[PDB]
Symmetry: C2
Subunit: 122 residues, 2 copies
């Protein structure tokens, strides 16, 4: 897989996000696209970091051969930009699988996303 | 397929809904379930009825061998209660395939969570 170097114009954009409870250990992973498409999946005994991976997997599954995805997660960006072969992470190997089956994917990090944010922090 | 007659204990209840712009033929379909799972899909060239039948389908697809669905569509209630074999609509045929796959499914009609879901399908129509 290759990552695009600039946005795909016309492709649907997913503002993926994810949150978890330190104490309850529960979370939400979801998204929101510029087409008004949406999704929230409550998670059990997870971590922020995994919710954010969860986020990015959701959007990879729901999307279309050419996609643009927007996280605020540095942790997920690094993994993906490294382009692993395989990982000991199951969730990761999954994403990895999803990226290989796409024609064009563009991912971007960012500090809209507040939309998905209110959403995930239930 | 056979419809249960009471809400199934232990199964997640899906509050399904759909809505379309009568002029633009723009619509949304989706659900909100008691476990906080949600979904909204943007639809093209559709009616209030196709939107509603789509909401059900989505629910059927995202749930598991046992499901409680609660709709406000009498339209969808009656096709589904009829226990059709086959129908002239693709959509419907897909719904059926799902119903058949399910272990247990209770479908109810209402005219709470159903409001959360309204607002969501309703935003942009």
């Amino acid at each position: 897989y290759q990552l695009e170097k600039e946005p795909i114009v016309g492709a649907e954009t997913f503002y993926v996000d994810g949150a978890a409870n330190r104490e309850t250990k529960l979370g939400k992973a979801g998204y929101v696209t510029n087409k008004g498409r949406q999704k929230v999946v409550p998670l059990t005994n997870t971590t922020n970091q995994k919710t954010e991976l969860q986020a990015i997997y959701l959007a990879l599954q729901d999307s279309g051969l050419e996609v643009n995805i927007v996280t605020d997660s540095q942790y997920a960006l690094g993994i993906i930009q490294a382009q692993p072969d395989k990982s000991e992470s199951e969730l990761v190997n999954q994403i990895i699988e999803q990226l290989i089956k796409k024609e064009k994917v563009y991912l971007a990090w960012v500090p809209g996303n507040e939309q998905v944010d209110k959403l995930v922090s239930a």
